[PDB]
Structure of Urease accessory protein ureE:
Amino acid sequence: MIIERLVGNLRDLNPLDFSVDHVDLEWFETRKKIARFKTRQGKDIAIRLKDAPKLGLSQGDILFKEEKEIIAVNILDSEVIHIQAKSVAEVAKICYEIGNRHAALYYGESQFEFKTPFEKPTLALLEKLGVQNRVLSSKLDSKERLTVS
Amino acid sequence: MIIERLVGNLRDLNPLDFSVDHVDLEWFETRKKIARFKTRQGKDIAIRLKDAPKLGLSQGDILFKEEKEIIAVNILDSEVIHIQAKSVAEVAKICYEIGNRHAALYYGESQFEFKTPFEKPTLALLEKLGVQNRVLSSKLDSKERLTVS
């Protein structure tokens, strides 16, 4: 059957207690509403999301929950530009320019840290502005994403 | 004759000393390179700018200078949304979203203050995000503009 709605998250736990099967998504698939996926254990699922999270599906988001059986979202690591701004003025410039490119942008671990998917234009852009950055493999969790309205 | 290059600014003064005639520009005309204007005293001028300022023509920028005669840029007041951010995270969100709209954005008088031209979508956007703002008539000087690259 069609999955229309989330059933909480592994964090609003769930001390498991549960047999947890995952749908492993790329960051760029987290804002899908109508899709067909296969879980890590080989089950088919189909979503037609209603009132989907604006940010996208996040790590641990529960799509299916029946007795001890859970299917939850796993977001796969990807190549990420980790940005370190040096001032508020630079945060402003960085976010303005990335917003202008319509590139995804995520909050980092602190006030002046941001994450954006690796693509050569964004990397070129950030060097062109002399902005401190580092490319690492890591997780872009939807819950840290900056919304566009 | 064609004006290709700026001749400094009234600020790198110029204790005047000079008969200053102005070209009165709207903020949205400051990034023109090829144009024909009339000065406040009724002189015709034509620009085909080479190595034009990336930000645009700024207040006091000198286009013409011969003996005591100067023609300089005046930017006219316009309706401006003055934005007051409350945190770095909010600066990030604001600039990201405005960049996404491809709307002009300017640095304000302090770290968390920004200015953007009044248009109803931008105003709607900022209320929609609960962002503190005020509409005033004021000058958008190109030298405070955030660049898009």
The longest helix of chain A spans residues 88-101. Chain A touches chain B at residues 87-89, 91-93, 95-100, 102, 105, 107, 111-112, 114, 125, 128-129, 146-149 (CB under 8 Å). Residues 38 and 44 of chain A are 5 Å apart (CA to CA).
